[PDB]
């Protein structure tokens with residue numbers, strides 16, 4: 300799974316089967332990292348109009 | 350892939366199924382790759 304974003308701590312209580320997370324608009328918002336099993340929130344990198 | 354979804358619910362109804370909502374969490378994702386068309390459940394006898 301490839302993508303770009305900032306990985307931050309999260310407070311989402313994932314169930315054991317659950318691996319990643321999707322927001323209202325269906326964009327992936329969090330992922331569970333292998334090896335360490337932690338849940339990292341994915342927030343899109345800042346962009347805007349110059 | 351043979352998917353087993355499971356849920357355990359504490360109930361106190363005597364005879365029929367309870368009426369309510371309970372989502373089944375996925376329990377086992379099983380890699381078998383075989384044809385299944387018929388099944389049979391296993392019970393336990395009591396000997397005295």
Ligand SMILES: *[C@@H]1O[C@H](CO)[C@@H](O)[C@H](O)[C@H]1NC(C)=O
Pocket residue numbers: 333334335
């Ligand atoms: C390796 O990954 C497994 C699950 O993918 C995990 O249970 C285990 O702790 C990991 N081991 C190390 C040394 O990261």
